Coordinates of C-alpha atoms in Angstrom, one line a residue:
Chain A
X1 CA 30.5 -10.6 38.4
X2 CA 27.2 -8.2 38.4
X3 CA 27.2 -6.5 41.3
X4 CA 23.9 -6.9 43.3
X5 CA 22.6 -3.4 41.9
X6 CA 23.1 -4.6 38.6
X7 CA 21.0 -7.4 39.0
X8 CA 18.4 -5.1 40.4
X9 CA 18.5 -3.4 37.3
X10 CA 18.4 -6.0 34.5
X11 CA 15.2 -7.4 36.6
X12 CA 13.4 -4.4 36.7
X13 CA 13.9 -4.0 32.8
X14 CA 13.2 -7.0 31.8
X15 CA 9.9 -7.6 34.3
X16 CA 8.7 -4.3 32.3
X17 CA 9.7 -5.8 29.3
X18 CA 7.3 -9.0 30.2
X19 CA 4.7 -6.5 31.4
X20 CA 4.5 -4.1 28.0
X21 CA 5.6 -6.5 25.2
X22 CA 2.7 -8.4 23.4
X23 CA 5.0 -10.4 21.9
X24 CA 1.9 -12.4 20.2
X25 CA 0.6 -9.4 19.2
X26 CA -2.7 -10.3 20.6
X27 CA -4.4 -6.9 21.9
X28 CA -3.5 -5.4 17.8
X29 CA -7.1 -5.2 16.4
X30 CA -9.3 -3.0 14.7
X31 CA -6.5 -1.9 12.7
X32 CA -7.2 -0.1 9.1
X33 CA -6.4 -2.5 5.8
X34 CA -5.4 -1.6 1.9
X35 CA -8.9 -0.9 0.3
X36 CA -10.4 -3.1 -2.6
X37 CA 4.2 23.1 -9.3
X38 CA 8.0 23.1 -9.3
X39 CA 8.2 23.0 -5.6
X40 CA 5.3 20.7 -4.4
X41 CA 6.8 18.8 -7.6
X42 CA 9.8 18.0 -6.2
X43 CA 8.1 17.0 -2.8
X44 CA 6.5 14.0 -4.9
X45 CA 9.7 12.6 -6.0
X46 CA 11.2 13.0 -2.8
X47 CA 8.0 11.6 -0.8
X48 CA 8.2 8.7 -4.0
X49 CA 11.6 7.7 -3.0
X50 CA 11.0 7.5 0.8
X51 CA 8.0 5.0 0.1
X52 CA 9.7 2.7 -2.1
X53 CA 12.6 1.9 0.2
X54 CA 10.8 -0.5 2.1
X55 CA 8.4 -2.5 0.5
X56 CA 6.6 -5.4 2.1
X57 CA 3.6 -8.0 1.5
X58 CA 1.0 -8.3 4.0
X59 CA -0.5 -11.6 5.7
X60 CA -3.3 -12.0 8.0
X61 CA -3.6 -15.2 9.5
X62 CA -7.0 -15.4 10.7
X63 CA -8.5 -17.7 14.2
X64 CA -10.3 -20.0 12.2
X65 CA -7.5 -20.9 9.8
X66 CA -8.0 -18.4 6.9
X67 CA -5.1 -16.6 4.8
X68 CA -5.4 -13.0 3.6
X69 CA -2.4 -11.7 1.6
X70 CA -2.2 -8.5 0.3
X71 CA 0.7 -7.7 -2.3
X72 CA 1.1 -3.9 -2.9
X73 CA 0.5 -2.0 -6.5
X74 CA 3.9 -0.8 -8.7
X75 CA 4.8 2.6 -8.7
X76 CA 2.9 4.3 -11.2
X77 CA 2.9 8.0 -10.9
X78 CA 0.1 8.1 -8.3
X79 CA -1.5 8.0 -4.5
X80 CA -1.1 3.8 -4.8
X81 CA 2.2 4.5 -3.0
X82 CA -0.1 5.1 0.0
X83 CA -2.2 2.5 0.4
X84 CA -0.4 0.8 3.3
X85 CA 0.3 4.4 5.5
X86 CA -3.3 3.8 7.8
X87 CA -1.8 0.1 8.6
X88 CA 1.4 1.5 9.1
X89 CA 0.1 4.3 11.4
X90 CA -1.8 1.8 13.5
X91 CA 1.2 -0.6 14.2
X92 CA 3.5 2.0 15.0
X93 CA 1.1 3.5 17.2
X94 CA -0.1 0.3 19.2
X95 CA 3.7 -0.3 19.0
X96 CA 4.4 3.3 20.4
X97 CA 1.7 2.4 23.7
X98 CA 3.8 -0.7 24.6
X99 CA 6.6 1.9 24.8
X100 CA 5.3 4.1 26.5
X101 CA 3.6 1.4 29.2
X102 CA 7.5 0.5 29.5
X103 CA 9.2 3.8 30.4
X104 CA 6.3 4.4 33.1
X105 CA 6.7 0.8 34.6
X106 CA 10.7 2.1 35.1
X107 CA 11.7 3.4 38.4
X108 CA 14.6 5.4 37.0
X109 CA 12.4 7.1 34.3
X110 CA 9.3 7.1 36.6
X111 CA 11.1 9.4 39.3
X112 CA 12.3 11.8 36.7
X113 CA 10.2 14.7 36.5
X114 CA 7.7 14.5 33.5
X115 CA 8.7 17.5 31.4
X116 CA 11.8 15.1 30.6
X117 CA 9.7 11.9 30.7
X118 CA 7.9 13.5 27.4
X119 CA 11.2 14.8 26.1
X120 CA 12.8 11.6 26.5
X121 CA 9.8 9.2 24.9
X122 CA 9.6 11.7 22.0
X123 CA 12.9 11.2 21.4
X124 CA 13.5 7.8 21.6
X125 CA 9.9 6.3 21.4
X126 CA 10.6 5.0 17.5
X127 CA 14.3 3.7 18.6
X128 CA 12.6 1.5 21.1
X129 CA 10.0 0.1 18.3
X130 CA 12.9 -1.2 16.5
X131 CA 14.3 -2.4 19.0
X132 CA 11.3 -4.5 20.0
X133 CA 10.6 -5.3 15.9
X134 CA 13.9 -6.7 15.3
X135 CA 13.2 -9.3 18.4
X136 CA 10.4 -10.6 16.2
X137 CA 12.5 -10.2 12.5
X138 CA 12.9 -13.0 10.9
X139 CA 16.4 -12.5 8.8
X140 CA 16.2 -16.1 6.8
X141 CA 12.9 -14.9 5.0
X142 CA 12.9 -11.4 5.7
X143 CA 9.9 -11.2 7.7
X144 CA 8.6 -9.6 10.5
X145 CA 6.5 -11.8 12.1
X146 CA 4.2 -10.2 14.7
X147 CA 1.4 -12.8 15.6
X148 CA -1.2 -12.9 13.6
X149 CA 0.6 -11.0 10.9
X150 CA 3.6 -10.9 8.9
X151 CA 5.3 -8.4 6.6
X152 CA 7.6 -9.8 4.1
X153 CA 10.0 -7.5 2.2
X154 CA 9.6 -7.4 -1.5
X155 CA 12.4 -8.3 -3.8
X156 CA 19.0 -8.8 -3.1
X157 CA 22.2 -7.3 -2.1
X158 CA 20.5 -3.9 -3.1
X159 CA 17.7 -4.2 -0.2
X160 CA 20.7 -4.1 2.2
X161 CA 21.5 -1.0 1.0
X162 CA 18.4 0.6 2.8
X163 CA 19.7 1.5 6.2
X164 CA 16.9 0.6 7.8
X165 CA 16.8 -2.8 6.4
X166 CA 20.7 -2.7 6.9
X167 CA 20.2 -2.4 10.9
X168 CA 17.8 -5.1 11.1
X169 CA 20.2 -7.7 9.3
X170 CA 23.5 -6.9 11.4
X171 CA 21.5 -6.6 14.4
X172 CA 20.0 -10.0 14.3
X173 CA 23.2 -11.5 13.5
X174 CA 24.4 -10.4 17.0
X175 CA 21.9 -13.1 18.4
X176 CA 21.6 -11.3 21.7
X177 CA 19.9 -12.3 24.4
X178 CA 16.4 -10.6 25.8
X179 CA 18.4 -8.9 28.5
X180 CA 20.7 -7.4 26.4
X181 CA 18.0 -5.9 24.3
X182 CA 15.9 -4.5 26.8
X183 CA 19.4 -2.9 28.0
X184 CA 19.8 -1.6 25.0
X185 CA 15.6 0.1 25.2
X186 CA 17.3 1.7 28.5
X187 CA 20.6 2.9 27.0
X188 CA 18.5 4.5 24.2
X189 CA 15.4 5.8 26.7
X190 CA 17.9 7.7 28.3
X191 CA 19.5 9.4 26.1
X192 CA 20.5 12.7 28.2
X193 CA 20.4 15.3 24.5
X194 CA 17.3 14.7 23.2
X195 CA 15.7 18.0 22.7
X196 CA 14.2 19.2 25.8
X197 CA 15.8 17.0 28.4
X198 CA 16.7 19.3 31.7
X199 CA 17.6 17.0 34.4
X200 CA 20.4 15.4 31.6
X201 CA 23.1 15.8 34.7
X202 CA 20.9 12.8 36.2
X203 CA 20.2 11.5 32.8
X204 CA 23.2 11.3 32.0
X205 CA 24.8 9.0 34.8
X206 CA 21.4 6.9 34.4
X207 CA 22.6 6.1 31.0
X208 CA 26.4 5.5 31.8
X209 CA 25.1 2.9 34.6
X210 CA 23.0 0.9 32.2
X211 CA 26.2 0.9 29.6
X212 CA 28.6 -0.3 32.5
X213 CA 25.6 -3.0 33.4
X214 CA 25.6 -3.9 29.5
X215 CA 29.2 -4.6 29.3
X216 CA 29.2 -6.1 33.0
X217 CA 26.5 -8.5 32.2
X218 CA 28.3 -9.9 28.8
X219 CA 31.8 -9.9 30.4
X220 CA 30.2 -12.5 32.6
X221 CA 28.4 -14.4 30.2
X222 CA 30.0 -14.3 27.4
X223 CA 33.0 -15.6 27.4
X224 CA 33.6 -16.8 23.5
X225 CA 36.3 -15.4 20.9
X226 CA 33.3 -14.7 18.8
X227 CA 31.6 -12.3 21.5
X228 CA 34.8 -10.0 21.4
X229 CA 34.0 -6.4 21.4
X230 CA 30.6 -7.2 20.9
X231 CA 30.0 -4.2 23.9
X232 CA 31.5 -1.8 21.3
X233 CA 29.5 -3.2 18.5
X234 CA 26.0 -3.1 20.5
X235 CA 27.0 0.6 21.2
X236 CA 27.7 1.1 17.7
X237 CA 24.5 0.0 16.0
X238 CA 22.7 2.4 19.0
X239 CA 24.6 5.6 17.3
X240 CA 23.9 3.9 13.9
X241 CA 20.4 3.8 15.5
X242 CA 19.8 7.1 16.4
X243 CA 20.7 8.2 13.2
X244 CA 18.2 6.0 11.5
X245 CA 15.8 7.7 13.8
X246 CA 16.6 11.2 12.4
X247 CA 16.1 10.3 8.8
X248 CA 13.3 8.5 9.4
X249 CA 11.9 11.9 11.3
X250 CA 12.6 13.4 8.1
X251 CA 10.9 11.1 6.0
X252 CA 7.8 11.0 8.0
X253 CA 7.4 15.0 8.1
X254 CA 7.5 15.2 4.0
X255 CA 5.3 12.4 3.8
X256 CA 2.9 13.6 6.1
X257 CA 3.0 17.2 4.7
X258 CA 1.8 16.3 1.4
X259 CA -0.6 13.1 2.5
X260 CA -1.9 13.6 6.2
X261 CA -1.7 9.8 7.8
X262 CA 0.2 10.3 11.3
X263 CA -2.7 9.4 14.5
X264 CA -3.2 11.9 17.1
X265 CA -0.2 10.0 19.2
X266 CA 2.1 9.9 16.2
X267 CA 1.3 13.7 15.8
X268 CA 1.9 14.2 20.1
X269 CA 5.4 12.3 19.7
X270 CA 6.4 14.3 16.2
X271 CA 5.3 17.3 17.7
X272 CA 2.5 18.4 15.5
X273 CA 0.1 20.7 17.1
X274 CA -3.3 20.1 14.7
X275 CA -3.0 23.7 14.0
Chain B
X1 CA -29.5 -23.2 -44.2
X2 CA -30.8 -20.8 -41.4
X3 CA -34.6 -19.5 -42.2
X4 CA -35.4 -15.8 -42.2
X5 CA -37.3 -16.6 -38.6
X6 CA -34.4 -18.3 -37.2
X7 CA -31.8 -15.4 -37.8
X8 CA -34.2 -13.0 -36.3
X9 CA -33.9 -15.1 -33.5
X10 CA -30.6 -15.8 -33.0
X11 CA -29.8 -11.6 -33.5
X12 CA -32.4 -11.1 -30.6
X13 CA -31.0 -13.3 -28.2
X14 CA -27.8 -12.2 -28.9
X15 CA -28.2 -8.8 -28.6
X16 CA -30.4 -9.5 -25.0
X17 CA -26.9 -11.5 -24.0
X18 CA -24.4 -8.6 -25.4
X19 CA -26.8 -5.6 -23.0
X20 CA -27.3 -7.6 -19.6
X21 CA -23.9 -9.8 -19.7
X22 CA -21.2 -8.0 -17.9
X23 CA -18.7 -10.2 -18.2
X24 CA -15.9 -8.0 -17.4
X25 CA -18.1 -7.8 -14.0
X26 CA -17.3 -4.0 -14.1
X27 CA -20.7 -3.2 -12.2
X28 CA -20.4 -5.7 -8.9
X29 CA -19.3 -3.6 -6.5
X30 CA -20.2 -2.6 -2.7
X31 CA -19.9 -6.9 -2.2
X32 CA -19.3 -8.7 1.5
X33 CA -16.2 -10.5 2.1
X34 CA -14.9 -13.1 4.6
X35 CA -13.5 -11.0 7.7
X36 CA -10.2 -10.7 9.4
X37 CA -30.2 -32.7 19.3
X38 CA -30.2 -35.6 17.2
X39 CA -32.3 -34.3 14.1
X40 CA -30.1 -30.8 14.2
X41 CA -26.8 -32.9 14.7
X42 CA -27.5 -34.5 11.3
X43 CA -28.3 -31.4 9.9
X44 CA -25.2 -29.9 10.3
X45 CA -23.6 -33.0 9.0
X46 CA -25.1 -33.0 5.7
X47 CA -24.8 -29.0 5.6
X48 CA -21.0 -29.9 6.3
X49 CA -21.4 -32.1 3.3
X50 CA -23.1 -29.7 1.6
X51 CA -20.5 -27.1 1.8
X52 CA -17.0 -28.8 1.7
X53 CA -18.3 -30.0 -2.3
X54 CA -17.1 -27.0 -3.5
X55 CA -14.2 -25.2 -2.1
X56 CA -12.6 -21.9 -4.1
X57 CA -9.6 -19.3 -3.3
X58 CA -10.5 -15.8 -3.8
X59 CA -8.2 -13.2 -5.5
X60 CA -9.1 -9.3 -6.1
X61 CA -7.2 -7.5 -8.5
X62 CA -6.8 -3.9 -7.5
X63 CA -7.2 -0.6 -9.8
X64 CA -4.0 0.7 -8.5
X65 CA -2.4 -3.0 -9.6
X66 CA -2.6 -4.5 -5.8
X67 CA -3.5 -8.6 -5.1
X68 CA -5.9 -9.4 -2.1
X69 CA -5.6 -13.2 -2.0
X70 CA -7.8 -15.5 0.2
X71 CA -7.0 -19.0 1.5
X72 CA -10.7 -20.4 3.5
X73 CA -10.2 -22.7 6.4
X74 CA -9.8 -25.9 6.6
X75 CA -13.2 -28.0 8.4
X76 CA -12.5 -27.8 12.0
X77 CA -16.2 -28.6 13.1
X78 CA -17.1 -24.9 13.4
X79 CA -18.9 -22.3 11.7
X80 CA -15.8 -21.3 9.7
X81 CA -17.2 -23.2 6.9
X82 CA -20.2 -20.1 6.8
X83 CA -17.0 -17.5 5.7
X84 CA -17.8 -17.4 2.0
X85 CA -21.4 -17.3 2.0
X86 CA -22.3 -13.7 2.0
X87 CA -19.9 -12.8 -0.8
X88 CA -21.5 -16.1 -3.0
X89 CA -24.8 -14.4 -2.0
X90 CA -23.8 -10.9 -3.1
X91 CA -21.9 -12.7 -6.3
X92 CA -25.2 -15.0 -7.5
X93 CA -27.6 -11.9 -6.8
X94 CA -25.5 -9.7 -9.0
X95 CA -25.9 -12.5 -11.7
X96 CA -29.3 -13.1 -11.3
X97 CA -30.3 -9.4 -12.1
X98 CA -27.9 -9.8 -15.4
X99 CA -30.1 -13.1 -16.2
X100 CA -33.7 -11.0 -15.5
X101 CA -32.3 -8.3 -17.3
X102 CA -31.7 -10.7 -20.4
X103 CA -35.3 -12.4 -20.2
X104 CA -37.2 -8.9 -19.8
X105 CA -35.1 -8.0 -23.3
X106 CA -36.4 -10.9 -25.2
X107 CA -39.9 -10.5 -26.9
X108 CA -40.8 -13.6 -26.7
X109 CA -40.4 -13.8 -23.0
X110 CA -42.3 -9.7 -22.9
X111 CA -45.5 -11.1 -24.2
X112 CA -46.1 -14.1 -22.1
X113 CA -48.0 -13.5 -18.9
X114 CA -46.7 -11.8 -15.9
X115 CA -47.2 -15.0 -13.4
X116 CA -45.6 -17.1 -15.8
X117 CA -42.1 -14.8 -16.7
X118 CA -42.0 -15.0 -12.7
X119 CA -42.3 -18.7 -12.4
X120 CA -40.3 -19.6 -15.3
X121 CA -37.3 -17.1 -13.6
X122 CA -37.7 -19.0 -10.3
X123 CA -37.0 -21.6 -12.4
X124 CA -34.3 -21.6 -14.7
X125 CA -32.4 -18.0 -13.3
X126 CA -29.8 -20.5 -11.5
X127 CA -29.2 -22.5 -14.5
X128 CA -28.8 -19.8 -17.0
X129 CA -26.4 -18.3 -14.7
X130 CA -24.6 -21.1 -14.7
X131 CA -24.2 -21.2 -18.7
X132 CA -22.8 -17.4 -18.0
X133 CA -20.0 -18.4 -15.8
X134 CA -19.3 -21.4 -17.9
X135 CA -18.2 -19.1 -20.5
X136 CA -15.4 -17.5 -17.9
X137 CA -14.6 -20.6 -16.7
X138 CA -10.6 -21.7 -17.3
X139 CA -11.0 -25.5 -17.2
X140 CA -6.4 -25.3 -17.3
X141 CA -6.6 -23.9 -13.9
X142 CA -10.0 -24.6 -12.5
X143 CA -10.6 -20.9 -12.3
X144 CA -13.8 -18.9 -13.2
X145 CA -12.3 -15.7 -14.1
X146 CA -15.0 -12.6 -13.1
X147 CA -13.2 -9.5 -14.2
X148 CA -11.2 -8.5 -11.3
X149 CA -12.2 -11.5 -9.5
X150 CA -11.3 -15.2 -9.8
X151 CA -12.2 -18.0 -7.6
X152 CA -9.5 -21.2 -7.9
X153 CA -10.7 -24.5 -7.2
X154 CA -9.0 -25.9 -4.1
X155 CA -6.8 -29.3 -4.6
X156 CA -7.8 -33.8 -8.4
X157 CA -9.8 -36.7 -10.6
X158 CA -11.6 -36.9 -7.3
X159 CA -13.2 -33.1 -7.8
X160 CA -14.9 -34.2 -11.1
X161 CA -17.0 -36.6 -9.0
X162 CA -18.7 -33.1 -7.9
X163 CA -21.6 -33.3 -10.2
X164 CA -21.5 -29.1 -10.8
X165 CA -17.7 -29.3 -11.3
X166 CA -18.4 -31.8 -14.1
X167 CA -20.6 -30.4 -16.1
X168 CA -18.2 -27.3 -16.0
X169 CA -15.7 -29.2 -17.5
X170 CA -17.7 -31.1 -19.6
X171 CA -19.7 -28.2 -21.2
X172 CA -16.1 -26.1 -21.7
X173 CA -14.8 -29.4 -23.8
X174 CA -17.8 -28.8 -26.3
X175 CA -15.6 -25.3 -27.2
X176 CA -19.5 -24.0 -28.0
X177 CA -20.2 -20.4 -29.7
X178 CA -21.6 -17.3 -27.9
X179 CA -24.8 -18.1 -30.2
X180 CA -24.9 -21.9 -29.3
X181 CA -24.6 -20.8 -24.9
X182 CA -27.6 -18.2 -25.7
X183 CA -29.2 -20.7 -27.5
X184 CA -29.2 -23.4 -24.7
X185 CA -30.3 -19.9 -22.0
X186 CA -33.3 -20.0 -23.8
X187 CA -34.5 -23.2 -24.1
X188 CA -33.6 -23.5 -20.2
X189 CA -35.5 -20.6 -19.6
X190 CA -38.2 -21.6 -21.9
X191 CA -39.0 -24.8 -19.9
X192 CA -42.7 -25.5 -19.9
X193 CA -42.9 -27.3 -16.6
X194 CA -41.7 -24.8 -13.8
X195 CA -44.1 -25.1 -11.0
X196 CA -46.6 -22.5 -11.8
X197 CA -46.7 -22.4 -15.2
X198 CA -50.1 -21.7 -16.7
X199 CA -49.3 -20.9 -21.1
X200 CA -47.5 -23.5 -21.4
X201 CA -48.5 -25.0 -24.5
X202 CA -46.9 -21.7 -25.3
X203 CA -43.7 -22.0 -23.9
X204 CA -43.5 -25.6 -25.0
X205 CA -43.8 -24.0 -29.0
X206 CA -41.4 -21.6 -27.9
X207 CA -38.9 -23.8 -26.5
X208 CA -38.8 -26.3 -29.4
X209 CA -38.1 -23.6 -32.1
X210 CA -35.3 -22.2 -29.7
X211 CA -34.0 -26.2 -30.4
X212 CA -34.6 -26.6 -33.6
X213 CA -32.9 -23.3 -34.3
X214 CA -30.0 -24.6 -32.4
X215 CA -30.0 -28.0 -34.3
X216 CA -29.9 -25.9 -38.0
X217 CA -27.4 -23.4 -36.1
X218 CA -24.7 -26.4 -35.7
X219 CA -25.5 -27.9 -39.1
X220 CA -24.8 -25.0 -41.1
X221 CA -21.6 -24.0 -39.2
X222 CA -20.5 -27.3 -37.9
X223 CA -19.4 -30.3 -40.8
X224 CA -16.5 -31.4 -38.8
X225 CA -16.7 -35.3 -37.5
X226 CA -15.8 -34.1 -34.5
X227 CA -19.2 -32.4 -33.8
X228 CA -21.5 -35.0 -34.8
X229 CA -24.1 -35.6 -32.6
X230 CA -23.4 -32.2 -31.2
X231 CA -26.6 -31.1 -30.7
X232 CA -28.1 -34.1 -28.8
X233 CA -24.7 -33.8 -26.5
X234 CA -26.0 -30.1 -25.9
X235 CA -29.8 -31.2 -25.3
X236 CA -28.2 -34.1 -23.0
X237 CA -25.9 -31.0 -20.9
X238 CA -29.4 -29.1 -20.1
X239 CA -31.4 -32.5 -18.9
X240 CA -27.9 -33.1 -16.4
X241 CA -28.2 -28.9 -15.9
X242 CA -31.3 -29.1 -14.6
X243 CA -30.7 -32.0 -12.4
X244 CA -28.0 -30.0 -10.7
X245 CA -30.4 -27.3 -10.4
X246 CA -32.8 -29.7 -8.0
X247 CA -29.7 -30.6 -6.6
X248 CA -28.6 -27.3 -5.2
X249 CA -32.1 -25.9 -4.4
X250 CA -32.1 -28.3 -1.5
X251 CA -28.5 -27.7 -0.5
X252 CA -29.3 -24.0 -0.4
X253 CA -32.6 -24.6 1.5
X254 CA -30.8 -27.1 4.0
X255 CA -28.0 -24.2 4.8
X256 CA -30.4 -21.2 4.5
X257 CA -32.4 -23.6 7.4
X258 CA -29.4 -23.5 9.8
X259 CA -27.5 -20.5 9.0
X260 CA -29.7 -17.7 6.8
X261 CA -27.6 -15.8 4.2
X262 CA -30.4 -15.6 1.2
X263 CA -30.3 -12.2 -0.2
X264 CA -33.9 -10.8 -0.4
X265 CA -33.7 -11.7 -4.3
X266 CA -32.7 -15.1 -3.4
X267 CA -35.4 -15.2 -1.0
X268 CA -38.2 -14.2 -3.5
X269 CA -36.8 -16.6 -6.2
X270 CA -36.2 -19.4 -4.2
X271 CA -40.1 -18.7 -2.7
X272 CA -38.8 -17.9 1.4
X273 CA -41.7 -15.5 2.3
X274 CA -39.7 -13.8 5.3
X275 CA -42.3 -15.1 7.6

């Protein structure tokens, strides 16, 4: 079974989880809504393409029983392709606080020294979001549904094709439970190569222990033929993670070099100075 | 057939319609829109009433080719039922400057007196602008399509008890011309008993050769059998329009009472002195 240390662990995580995850999405307000060369060419088609992979509808449920639904304009040769990047930037940033509030609640990353705290959130702060999004995916209608709000993906097989999209799909299909996600926010967190890290020999074994945890705690309670190497898949989709992560670094970085959108904390964890 | 007079006529009020009726609603901009005792009891009640009686979904069509849709609340004893008011305000106060636009065109309405143009305005503006939305109205879908606006009639027989939704219908059955809905705007706004009137054996000579104008309109361009009696169906639509005109002055009054949203224009044509 889990040893007692284990159990320490997976109660520490998952009482930070409770602690940093609005799961209602109740504290997400005063958010910003859609209003009412050869080289810098070549940007645009680029930057064109990374929009238009994922597309979603917008719904705003409000208190008093209200609907407002916002579908998003066609691509037609213009800046209508950035209508929904001030929403965006404030979800991923309230999202990117939560994260943050749950690496300092966490004694293992709270007693590393912070030159590696910083190195390690900026490395693994967007990993984490998904993580934490796909909890609240809804894979029937292909909706996010966070509270208040919802974001539906626009219309087949072809959407699956996105690896993004991809991720969220064959990660929900896993049905895991809360504890094995939250291990998963700790395998990720501490990720001992992120650029920057210096106390990675302590890093590292952090990491290895919540891995053994992982496949200690499904050994134990999971004993179906259908849960067979599903340790080896969850570590799987976490490489296949990572490398979402880097694209997505990518895509960001063109988008925000010819339209400026990221916040002053997306700008921190991307590493732009303002200068 | 039509008299020299009576083409003059009809050309003048035409062309008054064709300069101060936007009705691609191009120009309403900068408008609000819903966000994201015993005696007072009974009050609230009737302004309940008063409210529930017409119920509309709001969509805005976007430049770039984006949808903002809005679903109001249901009635849950709160002041949820307020949401739509200051956007009808800012709606009704862009029409009413199209209708004084269209009676300070009209030479006939120039040379009458200045107190009596301002009392027959406070008297007819809400009717007239009434006729204008008739002619945007889609009585298939219980729409009133306003450019890049519409507002949908909530969900059946049971809606056309709303005297206002009635005459919509009713008045979009007739299939009338641009000339014959001009026609029936002046003879509303030519009404020689507004409160205040002082020339009005003047307006009452002006207001039956806008009929009679009307009446040799339809039988020079009208011989089918289906629009006999035409013109008496017409002069019977104004007599109900004008009912529903004293009908919503004191709705308006009895809300404005509880829960102020008149515009300053509104104020000053429905006589609220601010004080």
């Amino acid at each position: 079974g889990l040893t007692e240390e284990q159990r320490m662990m997976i109660r520490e995580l998952m009482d930070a989880q409770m602690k940093t995850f609005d799961t209602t999405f109740s504290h997400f307000k005063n958010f910003r809504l859609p209003g009412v060369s050869r080289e810098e060419a070549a940007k645009w088609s680029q930057v064109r393409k990374d929009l238009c992979s994922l597309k979603v509808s917008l719904q705003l449920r409000g208190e008093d029983g209200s609907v407002w639904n916002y579908k998003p304009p066609a691509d037609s040769g213009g800046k209508e392709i950035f209508s929904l990047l001030p929403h965006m930037a404030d979800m991923s940033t309230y999202m990117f606080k939560g994260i943050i509030s749950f690496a300092k609640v966490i004694s293992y990353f709270r007693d590393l020294p912070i030159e590696d705290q910083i190195s390690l959130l900026k490395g693994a702060a967007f990993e984490l979001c998904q993580l934490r999004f796909n909890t609240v995916f809804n894979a029937e209608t292909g909706t996010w549904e966070c509270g208040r709000l919802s974001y539906c993906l626009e219309d087949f097989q072809q959407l699956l094709l996105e690896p993004m999209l991809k991720f969220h799909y064959m990660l929900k299909k896993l049905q895991l439970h809360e504890e094995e996600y939250v291990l998963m926010q700790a395998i990720s967190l501490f990720s001992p190569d992120r650029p920057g890290v210096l106390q990675h020999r302590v890093v590292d074994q952090l990491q290895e222990q919540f891995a053994i945890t992982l496949k200690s705690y499904i050994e134990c309670n999971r004993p179906q033929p259908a849960h067979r190497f599903l340790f080896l898949k969850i570590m799987a989709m976490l490489t296949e993670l990572r490398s979402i992560n880097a694209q997505h670094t990518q895509r960001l970085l063109r988008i925000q070099d010819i339209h400026p959108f990221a916040t002053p904390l997306m700008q921190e964890l991307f590493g732009i100075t303002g200068s």
